[PDB]
Subunit: 363 residues, 4 copies
């Protein structure tokens, strides 16, 4: 009959903590068969050797499989598990659980929150950071929009993707097959994977025309970007998982989503603009926030508003860790809550040094 | 007639003196009137941060050549306070304080003023205890007088350089038969910072003397100063007090105001400090000379009821994270990450918070 | 009454990699019901916020439970899972699987293994006499499980023990209790140290009248020469594996040990090999694994030469100590896939640590 | 014409500690006017943002200038200052001071320690890791051999070089000038600068023919390497500084140098081979060591002897920090002393995963 999306932001005590989700299931507030996606902030380093992402997915998949009486492998085929590592600064570990119920009710007036999920095929290592990833992601984004019953791309406000990275072993498998990889470096491969995935969002939504996107433009032409893509790389998968979040005229959700784009890492004005776009017009209405979701990164210029910083020179602390701490702190200072989703590395996601920011709010 | 000038100077590296040299070579700064240099240097801001000494050496070398004295004398004449750690978007820079007496008339009100005072040297067993507290309090009174400030409510930022305890000083304490406050050189810094900060609060009436004892030091976190900013040093044995405030008798074109961050994300306190310094709208933000704040990880492991990993993160020291967060918050209010944020905030603001001062053009 | 111990050192590709173990099970080399302990090196940071330890245990427990037709909870009650994080330098992630079976074969002493667990500890008990005394009780139980009655026949006592987090310190405070130290990284040292003194108490290496709360992590002249202790967020009790030789053993393996006097003491590595029957480089192929403790000396030096391990705010000293000692061992035996664990409080002298070798006879 | 070289390995308490050197000057054992080079291990992180290197050089240059009655600027023009950061593991901070003077003395008669020094021109950021750096380094190595009175490249046993790196500001400036740098990554720029400099050595010594070296080979063809090159990058200089160390028939030194090549990071055999090449035939004779100098690195394969390690995957600790800790520990365990010189990053310095190792010893 009618889609109704409920979103639960759940504090976690550890990557493997399923207790808050279990409380909501046990109380009858979540039917686990209606979960379609879980988006986590896990407390690993959010870079290459972050195993909290996999640990969190395994733990949730094992728990839900037992609850649902199905195998873990069926759970991971059915539910998107997108775990973004790195909870630096004051950023609080948590998961955001997306539930799509089928209700009898009519659609609420206007446009209300809608979510769609799509998975791509697995990518050969030589496809990462290249047009094969771009185009396959684009196809999956359009599929997820249809899942969400969003026709108009302007009603898409956040597209969250988990994507792969290159391991030493995967690079070796490509060269054994006579193939070269976009970059011979696992950490840099995260940026190419993130960037190609974000451009696929842009292509699917009509934010960028197809004839402007080529292999040579990926992670080079920062004039090209999506205003809603949020992409995250990890070792624990070989394809891209896509969650489209937007508003549909055919939805019974008591929620909406809105967004803006941070022009740089300290752009609080963009945080307030994203809150306003989600219907939050005053400080007292911030208790309607369900979550804030944003991308953060170090600007290639090595500066913010003409002021130097050491993020790209600091050999002790990787720059995506620093960018996550900063943007989370800025958002937290606006909304009074550090338990918000901030993901680092914003290649072709907002301008160079900035990133999209979305707000899911109660109506 | 007292006049204080303040120059916030971006730096390209710990040893970069070009910005300061430019202002000296143009006549805008006379090196003889420099009383203090407050630096953010881009090392890790923790134990093995050599950028603090590198920056001090580089500045002392340059200023000793320009004043014709030795760098040993320069370090005695000028207070070098180097706070390492430029995490997140925090921009390395130095802030140079110049104090001169000019022949201009009275102040149209109260204007920026600085005073300085020194304590006696502290026997190792005296650090972290009422001896240091009480002596620091006297010194603040002297510096207030030196600044020509007679209302404590006109003190807005009290820089202190305070000593610590070393092994040779540990043995000197048992060579006399008396133990020290703590059997650790790292914690002695936190006990020295806290004691000196409580001495500030005592001197200014921020807390009643009846509440301060050796047992409350670094335990009674409800006791704190709202203006003290302390840093533990290896070279001095006394306390170096620099009072910054507003005096009715000053020719400065600058004022100082302050507030207290109740926690690491308290942007409300940042705006209050700005308003206390005469910046009442986003349009007037260009009048900022610098913002000076303290950051620290809350002992509870939480901010506004939300857990964070600062105290559990074995890869990144928690003081580095606290500095990144507070810098980011202030920068998002003022639009400029080139502000001074230091760590180590015992009895400086509440647990998990810290004082925040703003120096602004009139 | 006759037990035979088999030990498999298995390279891993990630913390959750069970494929090498599954291969040994599917080939019939390991009956999974006979597994009694797994000792891993997992590739997290080996400090407080290392979740690779828990990830590895969870993955092994899930796999074994499915293979055995029992619950994960029953598996973790039956099998010791001790995951030591930190694979710094060239140290190679792997697991060591201990299998023990009853056999009927009929001189001399051969490898014996025993396992015991303690009760869970309250945060305010870590690093204090309650942990020492409960560990000591469990060590004696593990010795009986190993059928070792003479403490001189115990060559390595491997323990996993808890640590403090900020959240657990707050729990303690809310209950009106003070913890032994408020620094979460230093809490690992107190848990390791109290656990190691519990070994020394149980084995008679130190008398009880010499152990008190005030000695724990202060009197470095108190130590066990066989204790090897490892802390992690993933458990709230202590798990013990006693490894030694017994006359009631039909194993084709033996264990020997020595003590490294400092982090570069290759002579001690060669003495541990010789104690395990490996008399020359030409016999190194009989090594099953080498197991060692490493640490920064409290003096900040090695043979009078200063180092920065205790002063380095970017890299904790147990990470550096593990890289160093693994490198030294690897350069002697030609193989970096050996077990090295950092933090050797009351485990060998200040700056050193026990080192054991399991070898084919 | 006889040159006498003396070498003093001096423990340090901090990067700025000159007290050990001053003691030797004040006792008359060192004439400061005869210092030609100082090779240091300084206790910063050895990567991009290591300011202990420049702090040590500034401190040493200021001390020597006041001792010699000349300007700091003139001290740095006359004395090579090569500060290698990173004192990980048990590696002990120290400096090695090379004193060289002409002497009226008789034959050796064997070959004895010889040292030469040369400096290149400053490089533009866009010249680093490219043939401009290779070729200018090669010219300087030839000049330094001549200064050392070595005409037979087989009598060269160690060629120590300090070279530049790229920072974010230098990369961005290059972009504003319309110029592309060899790599857009500050940490990786160190590898390209070390590697080009090392191929400069191989070209100069005839270890590799010029026709095999091109931009495309640099940090790509690991079959190309020098067996005596030791290169070290730093933020604190814009040129390359070269110290050639070998033995000469025209030397009156009481010291000799020998070398070998570590095949991998745990090759203690090569440590013993280098000792033997320096005349140290047993443990009894290790009291004749003046210093041991070695290059260390992570192998591109991510393994040692077929065994995986995480050096290339660890986003928390850069691989050159790990490699230095490992190789210093191996050497210390052979010679019983961790106060030896180990530099990380051995691109075209020994095979992939290994590096040269030299021993300076009393005869
Ligand atoms: O990753 C990176 N990119 C740019 O443009 N500059 C530096 O220094 N690092
Ligand atoms: O300063 C320095 N040290 C080391 O070990 N390697 C480089 O490239 N630079
Ligand atoms: Ca962006
Ligand atoms: Ca405070
Ligand atoms: Ca020990
Ligand atoms: Ca090499
Ligand atoms: Cl001014
Ligand atoms: Cl940070
Ligand atoms: Cl505090």
């Amino acid at each position: 009959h009618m889609q109704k999306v409920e979103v639960f932001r759940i504090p976690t005590a550890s990557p493997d903590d399923i207790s808050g989700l279990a409380t909501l299931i046990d109380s009858g507030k979540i039917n686990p068969a209606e979960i379609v996606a879980i988006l986590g902030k896990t407390e690993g380093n959010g870079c290459v050797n972050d195993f909290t992402r996999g640990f969190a997915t395994q733990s949730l998949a094992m728990y839900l499989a037992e609850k649902l009486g199905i195998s873990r492998e069926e759970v991971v085929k059915k539910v998107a598990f997108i775990m973004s590592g790195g909870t630096e600064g004051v950023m609080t570990p948590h998961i955001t659980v997306f539930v799509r119920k089928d209700v009898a009710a009519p659609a609420a007036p206007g446009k209300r929150l809608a979510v769609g999920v799509a998975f791509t095929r697995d990518f050969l290592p030589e496809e990462l950071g290249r047009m094969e990833q771009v185009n396959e992601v684009a196809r999956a984004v359009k599929e997820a929009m249809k899942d969400a019953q969003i026709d108009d791309p302007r009603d898409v406000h956040f597209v969250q993707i988990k994507c792969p990275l290159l391991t030493a072993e995967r690079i070796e498998d490509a060269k054994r097959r006579g193939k070269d990889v976009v970059v011979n470096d696992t950490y840099k491969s995260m940026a190419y994977s993130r960037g190609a995935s974000a451009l696929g969002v842009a292509l699917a939504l009509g934010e960028i025309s197809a004839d402007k996107i080529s292999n040579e433009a990926i992670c080079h032409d920062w004039n090209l970007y999506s205003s809603v893509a949020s992409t995250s790389a990890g070792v624990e998968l070989l394809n891209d998982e896509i969650i489209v979040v937007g508003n549909s005229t055919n939805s019974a959700s008591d929620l909406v989503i809105g967004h803006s784009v941070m022009k740089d890492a300290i752009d609080a004005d963009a945080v307030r603009a994203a809150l306003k776009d989600a219907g939050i017009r005053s400080d007292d209405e911030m208790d309607r926030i369900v979550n804030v979701l944003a991308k953060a990164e170090a600007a290639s210029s090595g500066t913010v508003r003409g002021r130097r910083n050491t993020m790209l020179d600091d050999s002790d602390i990787n720059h995506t860790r620093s960018a996550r701490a900063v943007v989370n702190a800025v958002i937290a200072s606006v909304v009074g809550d550090p338990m918000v989703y901030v993901s680092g590395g914003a290649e072709h996601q907002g301008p160079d040094g900035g990133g999209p920011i979305a707000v899911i709010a109660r109506v």
